[PDB]
Design a binder for these strands. Sequence first.
DNA 1: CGGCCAATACTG
DNA 2: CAGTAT
DNA 3: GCCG
Length: 327
Amino acid sequence: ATNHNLHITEKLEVLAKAYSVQGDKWRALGYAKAINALKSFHKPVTSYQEACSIPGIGKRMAEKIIEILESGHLRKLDHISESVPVLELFSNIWGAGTKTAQMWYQQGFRSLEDIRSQASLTTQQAIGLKHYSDFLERMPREEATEIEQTVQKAAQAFNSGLLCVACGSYRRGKATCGDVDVLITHPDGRSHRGIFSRLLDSLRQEGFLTDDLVSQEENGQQQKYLGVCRLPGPGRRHRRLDIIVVPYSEFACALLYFTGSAHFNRSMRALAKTKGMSLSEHALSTAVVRNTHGAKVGPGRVLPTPTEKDVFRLLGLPYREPAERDW
DNA sequence: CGGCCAATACTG
DNA sequence: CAGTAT
DNA sequence: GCCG
Ligand SMILES: Cc1cn([C@H]2CC[C@@H](COP(=O)(O)OP(=O)(O)OP(=O)(O)O)O2)c(=O)[nH]c1=O
Ligand SMILES: [Mg+2]
Ligand code: NA
Ligand code: NA
Ligand code: NA
Ligand code: NA
C-alpha cells in the first residue's frame, strides 16, 4: 500500500538517520519501528490519542506527531548536530563506521577530499573511498545475474558438482541489487572444503576481482569473501561481491541467513530466542541456556534442518517465500 | 531498570 | 579486544 | 525511541 502520514514520517526519518549515524542504535531502532507503523496504517494520524494507540508509538513519539500537525514543523529537527551530514558522508565509506566517522570529524575533517589527503585509512577504507560513488549505487537485476553466473562458471570449472546460489536481495526477487551474494556448497558434504583458494585465484586470473575487502586465505577454514568485481566491456561499474562457502549439512540455515532480509533474520532469530532456541547461519539449536541479559550461556542441541521449511516448522512458523522476507 | 530487530566472521 | 561487516 |  502507501503511507498516509508522509508529512510525519518525513520529519521522523531525519531524526532516525541522525541518531543512527551517531551510534544511538536502539533510539534509532525506536524511530524505525514508529515510522514503519505510521505507514502500514490506514489513515492520517490527526489525534495525540490516535498516536498512542498505535503499537510502536508511545507518549514521546505521539507528542512529536502533534507538533508536525499543529505546527506543521518539528522544532527538534533544527537542534540536530551540524556534524550529522558529515558523519553520514564518512560512514558511507565501506569499512568506516560511526566510531571512525566521529574520530575523523573530531580531527577536523569535513569532506572526502580531507579524508583522501589527510586521514589515516585502513586498507578496506581506502578501497571503499576509491569506489565511493559506485558502492552507493544498486545494479540492475540482470547484472547481478551475470556476476552470479561468472562465479558459478568459475567454480563448476574445477568441480561440476558445486552448487552456487545467488542469495540476498537477488533471491528475494528485487529489481536492483546493492551487491551480489553467492552461496557455494556441495551435496557430497565435503568437496566444498578448501575451494576458496582455487575459486579466488581463478576469478583473479580473468581480472574479474579487482579488490579484496575481507578474505582470510591463510586459514583453510575460510568462511566468507567480501570483495569487489567488474564485468568486462564499456559502461561497467565496480560492484561489491559477497561469497560464502558452506558444508552441505548447513545448507538450509546458510541459505536462510544469506537470503535475509537482515531485518527478517533478526526477527526470526529473536523468535527462536523466546523459544529457548538459537538460530545462526550454521544451524538452529534448541535447549539453549541464556542469562538475564539475554546472552547465550549454554550451547544446546543442533536440530535437523534439511531444508528452509524445516527451520520455519521447528519454530512453529508458516513458511515464507524469499519474496515474503523482504523486510 | 533494561531488553529490543541476532548471531556470527575478519582485521589488526 | 573494538570496530565493522554479513 | 517503546514497553513491561
Ligand atoms: C547487513 C546484514 C545482512 N544479513 C544477511 C541477510 C541478507 C544477506 C546479504 O546481506 P546484504 O547486506 O547484501 O543484503 P541484501 O538484502 O542483499 O541487500 P542489498 O541488495 O545488497 O543492499 O546477509 C544479516 O543477517 N545481517 C546484517 O546485518
Ligand atoms: Mg546483497
Ligand atoms: Na502505542
Ligand atoms: Na561504512
Ligand atoms: Na587476506
Ligand atoms: Na552482501
